[PDB]
């Protein structure tokens, strides 16, 4: 029973709802808490400066998030996300100075806590909004078990409202309320060697680190031609893919895509924010098509799809006429192998956004694993969004441990497949 989950407008896990429907849960846009949340006593928040990589706040958070951010169930890995990773994933544009929060012991300025949200763009069913994505709650393991995380959530809500943004979607790797969608994790094996002396594999009893290697290996005997990195000239041409690609698997109409409800204009007004309120006929109306994703302009692209090296690789395909036609790209995080002082981390691609026009995505994805593995990535991971589960069927990809919760505050989203979610948290 939850003591903190059960005050929010989220859908909770006893909910009866009688019909598949979208829309706000609560219309409130004056009445939330607009004071900023006490800490403990010889606690104090501050904005974190991640606008310069260089400074020490960045520095306390990377050693925060590196000693005490996301493990394995068993702890045998965290995640050791860079410094040049986090500046990608949270210096996005559009983004707020305060939206990146802090928590530091007054007397030894050690930070203790982080939260963050980014703002992006995006649509669900017939509407369109800007939200935002919390990410990145973390607090120091000696703090743990003392109901901070719900002062740090609260902290971020406050701040998220105060720029008139009343929803947000955050991802969980447990059950908290109930999640719109569940996401599955499928690891490639890409370095077997490395990945042994990790242990996040074994050798099997009917099998040699031979075999084994041979097993896991990236085909090469069929290549596609045309890819190469992409560059800042393609942002345009990339914001079009996009835009047709969801034009594609939308869940509406071609006049509702093109007439989406702007949220953004109506949430001041319990009256005009009804419009946002839409039944659904039957949920076989959403099968095999996005109902939401996130919304690209050209800025966006130009930050989000780019090349950074041992962070995000973007790759695009060019047709005859030098038009791009595909995209794959992957970021790239390490992770602290707790337990091995000697070989200590290991580098691990994850899938982001990926359009194939003209080849299959299976076809892509092989071109993008190859790409990985000369990144020094020693697994490919991905999630089971969007129409990845084609690429996973038929493949090498061997299942993970857990599954990853899908949230969105202050919104009514239908239980739906992953398939039809096209939202990548970092
Ligand atoms: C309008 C805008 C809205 C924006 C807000 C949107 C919501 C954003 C939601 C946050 C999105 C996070 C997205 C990411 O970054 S997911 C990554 C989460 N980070 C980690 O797992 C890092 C390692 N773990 C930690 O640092 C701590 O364990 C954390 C900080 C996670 C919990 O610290 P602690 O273990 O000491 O717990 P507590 O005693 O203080 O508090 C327990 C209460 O807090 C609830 N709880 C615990 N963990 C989570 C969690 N991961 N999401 C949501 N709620 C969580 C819990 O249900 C319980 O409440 P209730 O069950 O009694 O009700
Ligand atoms: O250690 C871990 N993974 C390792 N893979 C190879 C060696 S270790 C790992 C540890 C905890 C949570 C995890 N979630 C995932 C993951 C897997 C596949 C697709 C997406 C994923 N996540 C990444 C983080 N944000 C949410 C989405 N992995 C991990």
Not at 91 to 104: F, S, T
Not at 367 to 374: Q, V
Request: proline fraction near 4%; charged fraction near 25%; aromatic fraction near 12%.
């Amino acid at each position: 029973p939850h003591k903190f989950w059960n005050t929010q407008p989220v859908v909770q896990n006893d909910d009866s709802s009688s019909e598949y429907s979208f829309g706000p849960i609560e219309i409130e846009p004056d009445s939330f808490r607009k004071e900023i949340y006490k800490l403990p006593d010889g606690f104090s928040w501050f904005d974190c400066n991640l606008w310069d990589i260089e400074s020490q706040d960045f520095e306390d958070t990377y050693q925060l998030l590196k000693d005490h951010y996301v493990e394995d169930d068993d702890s045998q890995f965290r995640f050791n996300y860079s410094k040049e990773f986090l500046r990608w994933a949270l210096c996005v544009p559009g983004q707020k100075k305060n939206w990146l929060v802090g928590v530091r012991v007054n007397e030894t300025k050690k930070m203790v806590g982080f939260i963050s949200a980014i703002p992006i763009k995006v649509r669900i069913h017939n509407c369109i909004m800007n939200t935002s994505v919390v990410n990145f709650l973390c607090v120091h393991k000696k703090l743990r078990s003392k109901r901070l995380a719900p002062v740090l959530i609260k902290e971020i809500t406050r701040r998220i409202r105060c720029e008139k943004i009343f929803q947000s979607i955050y991802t969980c790797g447990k059950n908290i309320t109930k999640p719109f969608t569940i996401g599955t994790y499928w690891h490639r094996i890409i370095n077997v060697k490395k990945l042994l002396e990790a242990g996040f594999i074994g050798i099997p009893r009917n099998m040699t680190m031979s075999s084994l290697i041979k097993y896991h290996r990236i085909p090469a005997d069929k290549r596609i031609e045309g890819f190469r990195p992409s560059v800042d000239s393609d942002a345009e041409q990339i914001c079009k893919l996009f835009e047709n690609y969801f034009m594609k698997y939308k869940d509406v109409s071609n006049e509702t895509m093109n007439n989406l409800i702007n949220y953004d204009e109506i949430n001041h007004s319990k009256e005009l924010g009804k419009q946002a309120y839409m039944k659904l006929d039957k949920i076989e109306d959403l099968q095999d098509k996005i109902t939401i994703h996130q919304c690209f302009n050209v800025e966006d692209v130009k930050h989000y799809f780019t090349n950074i090296d041992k962070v995000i690789v973007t790759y695009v395909r060019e047709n005859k006429n030098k038009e791009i036609t595909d995209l794959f790209s992957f970021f790239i995080i390490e992770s602290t192998v707790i337990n091995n002082e000697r070989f200590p981390t290991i580098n691990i691609a994850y899938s982001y956004f990926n359009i194939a026009n003209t080849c299959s995505l299976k076809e892509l994805f092989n071109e993008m694993l190859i790409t990985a593995k000369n990144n020094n990535c020693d697994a490919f991971n991905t999630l089971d969004l969007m129409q990845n589960l084609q690429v996973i069927q038929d493949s090498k990809f061997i299942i993970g441990t857990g599954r990853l919760r899908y949230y969105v505050f202050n919104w009514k989203i239908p239980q739906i497949s992953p398939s039809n979610v096209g939202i990548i948290l970092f």
